[PDB]
Amino acid sequence: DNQRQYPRTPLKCRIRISHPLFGELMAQTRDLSDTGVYVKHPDLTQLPTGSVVTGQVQDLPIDAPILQMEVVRVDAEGVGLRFLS
Numbered sequence: 764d765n766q767r768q769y770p771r772t773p774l775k776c777r778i779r780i781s782h783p784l785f786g787e788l789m790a791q792t793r794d795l796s797d798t799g800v801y802v803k804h805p806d807l808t809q810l811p812t813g814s815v816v817t818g819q820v821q822d823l824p825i826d827a828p829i830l831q832m833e834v835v836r837v838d839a840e841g842v843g844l845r846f847l848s
């Protein structure tokens with residue numbers, strides 16, 4: 764029954780989410796796998812599915828990677844994102 768290719772573990776960090784038209788905001792992750800991340804913020808919950816956002820974790824010693832992510836789903840609290848190839 765498990766349809767996840769990779770397991771998810773809790774991870775909470777500050778992440779900047781940006782989109783060319785919708786603008787940017789600072790959110791927090793909730794959980795992570797090798798293929799995707801859930802990002803919690805009320806203002807993300809109306810992103811269309813298929814939106815492509817960039818995310819970059821904040822406040823790391825090193826500059827974090829800037830990741831392209833697809834919005835695969837929204838819920839009451841945020842969005843499920845999949846990292847792009």
Ligand SMILES: Nc1nc2c(ncn2[C@@H]2O[C@@H]3COP(=O)(O)O[C@H]4[C@@H](O)[C@H](n5cnc6c(=O)[nH]c(N)nc65)O[C@@H]4COP(=O)(O)O[C@H]3[C@H]2O)c(=O)[nH]1
Binds near residue numbers: 767836
């Ligand atoms: N479309 C979509 N929705 C997603 C995805 N991941 C989470 N959700 C949504 O978020 C709810 C809560 O997920 P959860 O806390 O991981 O809590 C999950 C998790 O513990 C487990 N679960 C369900 N399906 C899977 C699965 O394929 N693999 C694993 N490992 N757990 C699953 O059952 C709980 C309840 O599942 P749901 O009733 O389905 O309720 C899910 C579903 O509505 C996803 O990749 N795609």
Ligand SMILES: Nc1nc2c(ncn2[C@@H]2O[C@@H]3COP(=O)(O)O[C@H]4[C@@H](O)[C@H](n5cnc6c(=O)[nH]c(N)nc65)O[C@@H]4COP(=O)(O)O[C@H]3[C@H]2O)c(=O)[nH]1
Binds near residue numbers: 767796797799842
């Ligand atoms: N960390 C994280 N990543 C997320 C979340 N929601 C989506 N993703 C990412 O987006 C991918 C594709 O999600 P999907 O198209 O809904 O495709 C999902 C969905 O159809 C199903 N699925 C997995 N978990 C659940 C679940 O809890 N409930 C339901 N209903 N479906 C699930 O299995 C497919 C493949 O799941 P994955 O291989 O995990 O692949 C997931 C994962 O990399 C989330 O809450 N947290």
